[PDB]
């Protein structure tokens, strides 16, 4: 029985869009139709309503790989089985600018923590999204005609961590920006069964308005969702 | 410059107790004179108002090493240097009962993320509290006549990776409860150079109302707090 | 310069179907236009030649992660920036059967030696093929109407390793397969901005030792599949 | 049974002040009332007697994690479950005097065999003293108006390994001191049910190579600091 | 039954001289007595035939620790025992010459998945040859009055990685060269029960005629086989 | 200057060998001529005297790597630079009887502090001993008519953790003994350049005259080191 999302079964649905931020769960929910609110305990706000016919769920997630964690395996236990996070990120490379959209396939992690105690040791499993949600994002991002990349990113534990060492040390391994929940997310959806994906609205370049572009994704996420 | 916590530099107490739902923040600004919320953003609200001729102000965390590391920095950042963090825990020995508390000696923790990127390497560092800080704690809690234990607690980053097997892992090693960010806060305290204390509110007992305990456990928090 | 293949300028296209076995890489080339031989120091055989008049290269690249290492680096010291591994595997789900391809989307792997390495510490790396390419792969099997899967495999590095847990452990893990190149391939490739992907033949179920299939067969879905392969290298 | 501490039934007190140098242990010895040699066996020098009419034990447990882990089992047995070590230290910052004192509230250690061997795994367990018997020996020394510093202690395992950062790597983690016994005597105490705590003499600091004391004036340090540890275990 | 190396039972010899390239077996094959090829498949090349009234076998390893470990196993399944790898490495130290050879004693390796998957855990188990044969391998060498050093060398998994920082720190930890298969020969070898042993031929120098080396050497290592 | 180990520089000998236990060092110095005892300070007795017309000591090193490491950098600094260890060990093995001889080809460990300290990183460097004064042991322990065995031990740094389980992990690893210290002594040689060696005298069997077996073999050790 969740101790954290409060809501009764019935209340959650199979599909749901997944932020950190408690606000923007709040503003996305007026995209769905006749949204209602069915947890808000320990500020963990989630909306339940409909989209293009099909019921959708928007809920928050927090900060950081343990507090996304709980969020999804009760999510998980209330119902939920596809999840597509749709959050902020700081770009690695110079040519990627502010507003723009960043589809993820992959996610970089350090060991230990979280992974150790789900995983039993140290091996790095490969940390990917779903194949087809993946695609289908990307299409639907074509679609609405959104400026979006395509790539691995560094899921951080240490906000304040990230020098510029650190800048040029992950995007030459590949990665073109840094958040903090994906490898959490595409690891414990593996191992979980469920249906992952991933994308970002760039609000910082670490190498070198958010409402607005936040609005426009969001949209193309739904369509995705709800196909 | 903060972008988590968006209080204005002046609204935030050098003295500071912090607790992880954003609930009981609010439940408990009741205590203070004149309480104003300085911070709503991202769901961290925050309050800051007196207590005993002293300004304080209560700080939400949310759930996580991730999640606390960035409050406190931000805290740090707007003036504060002394924390308490005020929160719930599950038992892994018999003996303790529910509602009864816990100050915090020392944690035990799982290398990995957070700790490497900011220790930059894997030693064992010694996870403790302020001593000083601490024993106010004791001589506060005795005074108010309070059942309560002194030991060390396990900081778990997996909230559903906790089976059988961990009770008695955990409490053979000294370890006499479990909760997720007594490590981090201690550690990051320790290179900061913050006053840090924890006290925790049995909610669960691993081995073998809630509101209640929390207010009379409050009030000798926060004399502590204002010495 | 290469102290293994030791092929001249201009010999090595820039596209390269990349295989361990040599002998694959010699029966493969016989479906390019004119093929030439262009090494065979250390057993690592390379051809070179055109499929629908587009110049590629066919290499041999051995087995485990420091061989097809050493292979990618100095291939790519002689021009080489696109490969596209194809070799066998072993399925770690009952439901796939032998001879039919798996398209693969990443790659698990236990930390140390290679990585370290080249990494300098233990982080672990996403290692994942080229996004485009491996799509392209896709849309190649499904016009051959060929069956195929798409997912994660486990690199090993020690093929006979006893693990009474591990068909389960891995499978647990989101990964369908177990080969030992593809962590190697992918993560040296985002290090040093080559474009990479992987399709493999399944020759065996781990899942399920109770099938099997002759040569006439398996050689028959290898020749098959090469086909969607090379289409792919010259899209 | 013990086969380092050759000790009868009952020639171990239940309370025991622990140092590394069989010197100093015999040394504090008269401070005791009729001290007799329990053992000798492999320099592991152990004298039991009264102070303020209670029996105790002074026991040697030489250099290092290994040591101190085999003498603590091998007295255990023999009865002991209150341990005191009482040694010398190197101070990490620039205020601490030598001749003065630290009472140690927890201890850094790198991941280890010792460690790995016993916990199973190598997870960061918290390596502290007993609460209570910290507070005694923190009243005790203040009552005797004594100069110490309560803090953190990196137990290290090499005194001669070369770190350009020593000083400042473990200064900046929250630690004042080094020494090399602590962490282990602190977990393993955890783990197997002894009260344990901890008092250092500053013999040097590294933080300041400049200072110096004089054996006479050491000495002195330590026989002072001796009479409040033994009024706390005989508390 | 073996997968790579398909030799007929009885097709291989209990004695076996293993070397990384497929052409240096071919040539080597020419110092046996009425040699005749057993395997050719994926290009392990494998010779057997007779030295000194013994049978004797020249396998070929291929590159890296992997590779090896597969040819090792699978030639032990067909009844091989007793292995001596016959190759070339990269001295460390700048008083040893191109040509001359190494007799190594042990071999430093970076802990890693092949190790992980065999050993089970991080130990560091010692890899070291079998010390009868590798003192026979000395009185032939010496017997043939040829220039030999003894010593421990440097596995390595990555060739193309092994800058100049490399040179000073692995010379300082007491290895005098570096090749990419020895530590994996040696601790197979102590679990499975093998008589292993290797002398390596120095190609070239990092801290600074080759066929008649090769040709010289293998004559002292096949006597030390058949002794 | 050496601040455990204070005996006079010209005090010690290039040739040591050394010991654990004090009471043993004591009882050795007897086979020397004109023995004099050089340190006491801490209990690490140091004894120094001639034998075979050559200049030799005899020292304590109590137990533990840390122990070792410490006695064996001072007496290095005080001009020694020549090690044979001479100690106690429990067989791994059951055809291995009480009294009998093992003459150390290399010693097994798990990664810890010690070595990450000394190393500066997790590599698994080769601890072995050197080559061409552990084939003089051979040679001196043979003309002597003592029944040896030459293999690996592993050197562990937990006495009371080491339970049955622990008997066929390490023996299948190909180790026949365990003892405490020469992983210790062959690895800090190694990168100190010292000379060292280890020969140990079964105490225990853990498969299945102590007073004797120690004086028969000192003197084929004394016989080794001044040859
Ligand atoms: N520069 C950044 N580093 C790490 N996380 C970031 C960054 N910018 C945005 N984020 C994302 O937003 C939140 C932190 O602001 C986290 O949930 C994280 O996923
Ligand atoms: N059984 C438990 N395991 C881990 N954290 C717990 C437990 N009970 C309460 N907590 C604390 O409460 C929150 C999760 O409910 C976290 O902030 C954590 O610190
Ligand atoms: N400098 C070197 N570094 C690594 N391996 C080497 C070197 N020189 C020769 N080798 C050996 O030769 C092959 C690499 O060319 C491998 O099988 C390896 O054992
Ligand atoms: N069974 C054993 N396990 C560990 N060390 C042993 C054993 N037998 C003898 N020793 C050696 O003797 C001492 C412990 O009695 C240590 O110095 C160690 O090297």
Same mark, same amino acid.
Request: glycine letters at 8%; a neutral charge.
């Given at each position: 029985?969740?101790?954290?999302?409060?809501?009764?079964?019935?209340?959650?649905?199979?599909?749901?869009?997944?932020?950190?931020?408690?606000?923007?769960?709040?503003?996305?929910?007026?995209?769905?139709?006749?949204?209602?609110?069915?947890?808000?305990?320990?500020?963990?706000?989630?909306?339940? *309503?409909?989209?293009?016919?099909?019921?959708?769920?928007?809920?928050?997630?927090?900060?950081?790989?343990?507090?996304?964690?709980?969020?999804?395996?009760? $999510?998980?236990?209330?119902?939920?089985?596809?999840?597509?996070?749709?959050?902020?990120? *700081?770009?690695?490379?110079?040519?990627?600018?502010?507003?723009?959209?960043?589809?993820?396939?992959?996610?970089?992690?350090?060991? *230990?923590?979280?992974?150790?105690?789900?995983?039993?040791?140290?091996?790095?499993?490969?940390?990917?999204?779903?194949?087809? $949600?993946?695609?289908?994002?990307?299409?639907?991002?074509?679609?609405?005609?959104?400026?979006?990349?395509? *790539?691995?990113?560094?899921?951080?534990?240490?906000?304040?961590? @990230?020098?510029?060492?650190?800048?040029?040390?992950?995007?030459?391994?590949?990665?073109?920006? +840094?958040?903090?929940?994906?490898?959490? $997310?595409?690891?414990?959806?593996?191992?979980?069964?469920?249906?992952?994906?991933?994308?970002?609205?760039?609000?910082?370049?670490?190498?070198?308005?958010? @409402?607005?572009? +936040?609005?426009?994704?969001?949209?193309?996420? $739904?369509?995705?969702?709800?196909?």
């Amino acid at each position: 029985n969740p101790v954290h999302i409060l809501a009764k079964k019935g209340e959650v649905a199979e599909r749901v869009l997944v932020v950190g931020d408690p606000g923007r769960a709040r503003l996305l929910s007026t995209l769905l139709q006749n949204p209602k609110l069915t947890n808000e305990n320990r500020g963990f706000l989630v909306y339940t *309503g409909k989209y293009n016919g099909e019921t959708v769920s928007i809920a928050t997630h927090g900060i950081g790989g343990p507090s996304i964690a709980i969020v999804l395996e009760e $999510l998980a236990m209330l119902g939920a089985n596809v999840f597509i996070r749709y959050g902020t990120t *700081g770009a690695l490379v110079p040519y990627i600018n502010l507003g723009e959209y960043i589809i993820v396939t992959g996610a970089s992690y350090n060991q *230990g923590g979280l992974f150790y105690q789900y995983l039993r040791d140290n091996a790095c499993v490969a940390s990917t999204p779903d194949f087809e $949600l993946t695609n289908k994002l990307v299409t639907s991002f074509s679609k609405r005609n959104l400026k979006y990349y395509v *790539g691995n990113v560094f899921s951080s534990d240490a906000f304040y961590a @990230e020098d510029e060492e650190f800048v040029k040390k992950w995007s030459s391994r590949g990665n073109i920006a +840094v958040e903090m929940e994906c490898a959490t $997310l595409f690891t414990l959806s593996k191992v979980k069964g469920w249906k992952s994906a991933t994308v970002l609205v760039v609000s910082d370049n670490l190498a070198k308005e958010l @409402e607005k572009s +936040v609005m426009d994704g969001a949209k193309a996420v $739904l369509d995705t969702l709800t196909s």
